[PDB]
Design a protein around this motif. Structure first.
Motif, PDB file in Angstrom:
ATOM      1  N   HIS A 137      26.658 -39.937  72.318  1.00  0.00           N
ATOM      2  CA  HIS A 137      25.920 -40.688  73.331  1.00  0.00           C
ATOM      3  C   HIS A 137      24.552 -40.974  72.705  1.00  0.00           C
ATOM      4  O   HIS A 137      23.806 -40.050  72.396  1.00  0.00           O
ATOM      5  N   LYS A 138      24.234 -42.255  72.519  1.00  0.00           N
ATOM      6  CA  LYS A 138      22.984 -42.686  71.878  1.00  0.00           C
ATOM      7  C   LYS A 138      22.902 -42.073  70.464  1.00  0.00           C
ATOM      8  O   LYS A 138      21.935 -41.380  70.140  1.00  0.00           O
TER       9      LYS A 138
ATOM     10  N   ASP B 121      22.927 -37.215  67.293  1.00  0.00           N
ATOM     11  CA  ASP B 121      22.948 -38.125  68.438  1.00  0.00           C
ATOM     12  C   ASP B 121      21.998 -37.549  69.508  1.00  0.00           C
ATOM     13  O   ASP B 121      21.280 -36.572  69.230  1.00  0.00           O
ATOM     14  N   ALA B 122      21.996 -38.105  70.723  1.00  0.00           N
ATOM     15  CA  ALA B 122      21.067 -37.634  71.755  1.00  0.00           C
ATOM     16  C   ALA B 122      21.554 -36.476  72.613  1.00  0.00           C
ATOM     17  O   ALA B 122      20.815 -36.025  73.494  1.00  0.00           O
ATOM     18  N   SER B 123      22.753 -35.966  72.346  1.00  0.00           N
ATOM     19  CA  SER B 123      23.298 -34.888  73.142  1.00  0.00           C
ATOM     20  C   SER B 123      23.661 -33.603  72.411  1.00  0.00           C
ATOM     21  O   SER B 123      23.503 -32.513  72.954  1.00  0.00           O
ATOM     22  N   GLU B 124      24.208 -33.727  71.205  1.00  0.00           N
ATOM     23  CA  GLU B 124      24.609 -32.575  70.427  1.00  0.00           C
ATOM     24  C   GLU B 124      23.438 -31.843  69.804  1.00  0.00           C
ATOM     25  O   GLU B 124      22.466 -32.459  69.377  1.00  0.00           O
ATOM     26  N   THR B 125      23.546 -30.519  69.752  1.00  0.00           N
ATOM     27  CA  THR B 125      22.480 -29.677  69.219  1.00  0.00           C
ATOM     28  C   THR B 125      22.677 -29.258  67.776  1.00  0.00           C
ATOM     29  O   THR B 125      21.884 -28.487  67.256  1.00  0.00           O
TER      30      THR B 125
ATOM     31  N   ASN C 205      22.604 -41.439  66.232  1.00  0.00           N
ATOM     32  CA  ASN C 205      21.361 -41.629  65.491  1.00  0.00           C
ATOM     33  C   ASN C 205      21.708 -42.239  64.130  1.00  0.00           C
ATOM     34  O   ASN C 205      21.680 -41.560  63.094  1.00  0.00           O
TER      35      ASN C 205
ATOM     36  N   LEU D 267      22.331 -30.722  64.644  1.00  0.00           N
ATOM     37  CA  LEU D 267      21.226 -30.936  63.725  1.00  0.00           C
ATOM     38  C   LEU D 267      20.097 -29.966  64.056  1.00  0.00           C
ATOM     39  O   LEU D 267      19.557 -29.304  63.171  1.00  0.00           O
ATOM     40  N   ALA D 268      19.749 -29.866  65.340  1.00  0.00           N
ATOM     41  CA  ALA D 268      18.678 -28.977  65.772  1.00  0.00           C
ATOM     42  C   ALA D 268      18.974 -27.513  65.459  1.00  0.00           C
ATOM     43  O   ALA D 268      18.055 -26.787  65.089  1.00  0.00           O
ATOM     44  N   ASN D 269      20.240 -27.085  65.581  1.00  0.00           N
ATOM     45  CA  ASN D 269      20.621 -25.698  65.284  1.00  0.00           C
ATOM     46  C   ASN D 269      20.425 -25.376  63.817  1.00  0.00           C
ATOM     47  O   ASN D 269      19.844 -24.345  63.475  1.00  0.00           O
TER      48      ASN D 269
ATOM     49  N   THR E 129      32.482 -37.937  68.830  1.00  0.00           N
ATOM     50  CA  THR E 129      31.902 -38.630  69.997  1.00  0.00           C
ATOM     51  C   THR E 129      30.382 -38.474  70.141  1.00  0.00           C
ATOM     52  O   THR E 129      29.863 -37.361  70.062  1.00  0.00           O
TER      53      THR E 129
END
Ligand SMILES: [Zn+2]
Lengths: 49, 397, 397, 397
Positions: C153-154, C337-341, C156, C343-345, C151
């Motif tokens: 939201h926005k 996506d715009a909510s999950e962390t 990528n 990739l950033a982690n 799932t």
């Protein structure tokens, strides 16, 4: 016709209880819960402590 | 209905908590619940489908139970189980889908399918369990009668509307005054324009106003309000109100003066903000009213003075605007938003199976049409249908 | 791997349900599971590190169980426990991180580290449980070979791409016709411009088209489609295609005519929308095709007529556009996506420990580069790495 | 405090797992926990309210227990239970609200109400259970002192700020050079303008820079960076710095040259990106610095050359810009974001009950004011108040 395993037991826990989550049959099944979890009702006052 | 729910958290909290390894005492409370089901089932025949390009499959049961012995779960235990779950999975799918199409009108908030009408039966109620799925949590509270509620991010409350209103116009459309806007989803952008730059206006100020009436009340809304309407800050050639010709809009932007946002509920001001840009809270409202003004600059450098002559032609059109976005809010009625897949799930299943247009929902489950005429029947059907979509997504995505 | 998971929900559902107060009976099914672990562990030696700025810490075990059976949890019980958990916490961290940097083309969808290669061992499998964490739920279903699902939201899905295509141009760049766009993340903005305002075009209409091919299929997408491309509605000085000079773009915007959006899957139209702005559903597609036209206004007020002469110079450039945003969608492959962390982690742990560029991922885990060439190897490694990041975030944020 | 938590997951995991049907075993571990509570309560009296338009209600406790006696819950069992829960529901509401309004400087963090000051009492602690609610999970870890952590979407870190800085100006405002921006929420848009198009600038390049200092460090941020600032790409009439007159801004946009984004932490560059548009990761920073340049086009077609003369008047104003949006990030301090309803809940309860302005929070819980002067006291009070709002939302939305 439920033998298969004449029931092997090893003490500690509730050997009656366990029969509850065991076989299925409703009549049989109510007995178990009513008897197993059946306790005393701790009641206070009775027209004086 | 509630029946249906269980059937799932049953499987999820199942296909999840039952893997090669774990000790028995991690699911004792679980195994039990499970079996109970199997029993109630076996013997009852079901049928699903029939409408559109949707197959018609029959289901029969007489599946074995599950050993409540082994201490540690041996691989062999799993497989002999997964094989029994994969019939319930492929089943439920065919079940949800079947009742995710029929529509009624009055008492259209209830079951419809020959599959479900049999589930609400009493002999099946022996299954309910762990109702912690936001949606069911709300289904129940509603059945009884209480204050429901859901959580939405960038909700979809505004039916698409993009238009203008000329308060002063003439055939040549060379000296107009009015507003143009875009209401869509959770956002509103509105611009007020005055080709004359309030040259002959009292106090050299032109007042503007934009009112938007929500079809449902939103509570606990976190909102971003910013000055300017970027969407209406560029040159445009627009069709006239009667469609007979086209006019030219050549904006130059000034800061909106005396900005006042009111969030009203039944005509009463619940929240009011005067020129406050950034994040504001609107706690309960069914209407938003944005009032703002264009004030002719009292002091102008030559370059500015040159844009605003005392006489026509007016070639640079003074424009002031506002942008408002509802980031999050709570609604007592189900709505589409920017995060939940409910609307998309329902719309997708109907499209894939070529489901014919029914008597309740607009063709294609069109959101704008739906929210524009959000009747009680559409809402009850939407909620039923959204709740089923959410039950389905616990297992099938 | 699945091993790893447990180790956490173990601790969370632990450092959470184990507090001064609650009765034993609230964790009986829990305590057990826990102990089981300790046993399996005790005695086995471990090592983590050996790369960039990553310490090499060794871990030895020798711990006892929890026989202290007291109805209510006395404070003293907690502390003697928290002290034993804080070794597993500070451990797992050093474990995740170690297998969150190693990559492999000969196949990375598998254990790499001397830490994990030992975990997949059989004697450890005695641990799994409560797999309700969206990511593991999906890891399993995959390693068994079957339809997955997530799932966003926005999402990528679009690698950054900002460019133009001149369909009619000349050295002076004074009478161009073509399109310019920005595809990035979950959004597409595209404008079609015709300096001549279709003066010599058949039916005075210029056709435009913009096609975007997704690297992965998106299903159940909720999409916002709006007329106009604000990003391309203002004056610009742009570099020529050959980089030798710069051209001037001075847009004036008209409504896009005959808008048609097609969501295709393998060349087939799955969804098609004709001039429908607002919220639309695209249920399954790997390609989006936006077709729109600029139609010279058949009727023009003087102000408009003045912008569009019969002969050059063409000083106001007729432009029509569209904006499309994917609010939410489901993908069978992991994506940022715009909510999950996630990739950033992953990106953050690698950056903090100065992890050298490997053979699979682009330098810096660059999203655009990754999604542009989203090979099977990058996806398997990304999924492994995202699933680990999600396991880690249950305890360490 | 932790007390409070339980009182809820108690009811939710209750009003959810307890309904006409379920088999005892899924709640044995539950029923117990429940009763335990009732006992501890009965006898004690509570004082809720007594401020503003807040009802002062008294509460006495004298309720029965539960029938562990039956097997499969019979309807009659539910109703005799729901009736006992609906007193706790309508209670807790009146409890949360009461401590969701009081504030104090010195000891702002701790509990304040005559309702809660009695809850932290020792004789109550016998209640805690299942602390997996993201917020409590973090409350605890904070009273112990550790790397806490929260999850957000389009976080609200930037206090609203919309302004400009003229680096070169003169009374007529006909040849300006400087920057203008909008920092709000999770977004930054900044434009650098040079009316002279760097005609007399060294290397025909004008350097620009925009620095934004966060009030709290953000970690694991997923960020979208795009060239151009649409917000500052249209004609504007702006007030002069001294408010004495108005200037004209007539932008023409060029690509920002030598774009460099630095995410700094305590003056140190943690992440740096050179001209990378699209999705980038900033893993730990308290400051963002955007540097970009306007470079006069070395080669210009006639149409372009015409916009940039060697001598004034300068009628087309060369502008370059950037847009940066923080999609998601983690912060060790609570913040408002685009998805959570905490701020809105707290603000709404205070507004509805006409709660007087206190000594800690700005009037109306104004976000910009709060984040601008985010003192330790405001943060401790905000966290207490946000945690309570989250406890309340488990039952009342
Ligand atoms: Zn968003």
């Amino acid at each position: 016709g439920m033998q298969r395993m004449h029931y092997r037991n090893g003490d500690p826990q509730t050997p009656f209880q366990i029969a509850e989550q065991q076989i299925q049959n409703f009549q049989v099944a109510n007995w178990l819960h009513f008897v197993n979890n059946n306790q005393f009702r701790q009641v206070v006052i009775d027209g004086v402590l | 209905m509630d029946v249906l729910y269980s059937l799932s958290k049953t499987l999820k909290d199942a296909r999840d908590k039952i893997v090669e390894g774990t000790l028995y005492s991690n699911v004792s409370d679980l195994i039990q619940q499970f079996n109970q089901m199997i029993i109630t089932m076996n013997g009852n025949e079901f049928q699903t489908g029939g409408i559109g390009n949707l197959p018609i499959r029959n289901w029969n049961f007489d599946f074995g139970l599950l050993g409540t012995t082994l201490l540690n779960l041996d691989a062999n235990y799993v497989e002999t189980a997964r094989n029994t779950i994969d019939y319930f999975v492929d089943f439920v799918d065919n079940v949800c889908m079947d009742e995710m199409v029929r529509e009624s009108q009055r008492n259209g908030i209830a079951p419809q399918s020959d599959s479900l009408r049999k589930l609400s039966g009493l002999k099946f109620k022996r299954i309910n369990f762990d109702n912690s799925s936001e949606y069911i949590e709300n289904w129940n509270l509603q059945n009884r009668r209480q204050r429901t509620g859901f959580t939405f991010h960038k909700p979809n409350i505004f039916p698409y509307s993009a238009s203008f209103t000329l308060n002063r116009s003439q055939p040549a459309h060379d000296n107009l005054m009015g507003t143009m806007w875009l209401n869509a989803g959770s956002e509103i952008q509105v611009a007020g324009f005055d080709y004359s730059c309030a040259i002959n206006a009292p106090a050299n100020t032109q007042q503007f106003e934009h009112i938007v009436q929500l079809r449902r009340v939103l509570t606990t809304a976190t909102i971003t309000l910013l000055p300017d309407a970027e969407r209406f800050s560029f040159p445009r050639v627009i069709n006239s109100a009667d469609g007979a010709t086209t006019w030219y809009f050549n904006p130059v932007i000034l800061r909106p003066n005396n900005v006042e946002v009111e969030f009203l509920l039944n005509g009463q001001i619940i929240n009011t903000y005067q020129a406050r840009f950034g994040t504001i809270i609107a706690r309960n409202f069914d209407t938003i009213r944005l009032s703002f003004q264009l004030m002719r600059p009292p002091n102008m450098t030559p370059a500015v003075a040159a844009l605003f002559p005392n006489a026509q032609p007016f070639e640079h059109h003074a424009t002031v605007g506002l942008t408002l976005r509802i980031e999050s809010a709570v609604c007592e009625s189900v709505l589409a938003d920017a995060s939940e897949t409910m609307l998309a799930n329902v719309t997708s299943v109907r499209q894939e199976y070529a489901i014919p247009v029914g008597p309740v929902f607009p063709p294609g489950m069109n959101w704008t049409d739906l929210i524009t005429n959000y009747s009680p029947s559409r809402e009850d059907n939407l909620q039923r249908v959204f709740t089923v979509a959410s039950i389905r997504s616990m297992l099938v995505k």
